[PDB]
């Protein structure tokens, strides 16, 4: 019906600015440390 | 054996760095100063 030479246009649904715009085509219209390694009873203990 | 040098250590200053107490620890005046005596001698 709508289709124009070859072209399959049927498929369509037929029935502040206020710009207007084109219907179709819309364009303006832990852990903590130990005493060990922590140097002390490494350099002590004159018992 | 880093156990055993740390257990020594515990045991010395165990000993070393324990405070006296009710004892020798005899205080100054300055500690044994009575604020109660003497605002009732100035009163």
Same mark, same amino acid.
């Given at each position: 019906?709508?289709?124009?030479?070859? $072209?399959?246009?049927?498929?369509?649904?037929?029935?502040?600015?206020?710009?207007?715009?084109?219907?179709?085509?819309?364009?303006?219209?832990?852990?903590?440390? $130990?005493?060990?390694?922590?140097?002390?009873?490494?350099?002590?203990?004159?018992? | 054996? +880093?156990? +055993?040098?740390?257990? +020594?250590? +515990?045991?010395?200053?165990?000993?070393?760095?324990?405070?006296?107490?009710?004892?020798?620890?005899?205080?100054?005046?300055?500690?044994?100063?009575?604020?109660?005596?003497?605002?009732?001698?100035?009163?």
């Amino acid at each position: 019906x709508x289709x124009x030479x070859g $072209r399959x246009x049927x498929x369509x649904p037929x029935x502040x600015x206020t710009x207007x715009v084109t219907x179709l085509x819309x364009x303006x219209x832990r852990x903590y440390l $130990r005493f060990h390694x922590x140097x002390y009873x490494x350099x002590x203990x004159x018992x | 054996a +880093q156990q +055993q040098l740390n257990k +020594q250590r +515990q045991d010395f200053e165990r000993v070393r760095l324990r405070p006296e107490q009710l004892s020798n620890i005899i205080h100054d005046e300055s500690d044994t100063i009575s604020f109660r005596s003497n605002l009732l001698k100035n009163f």
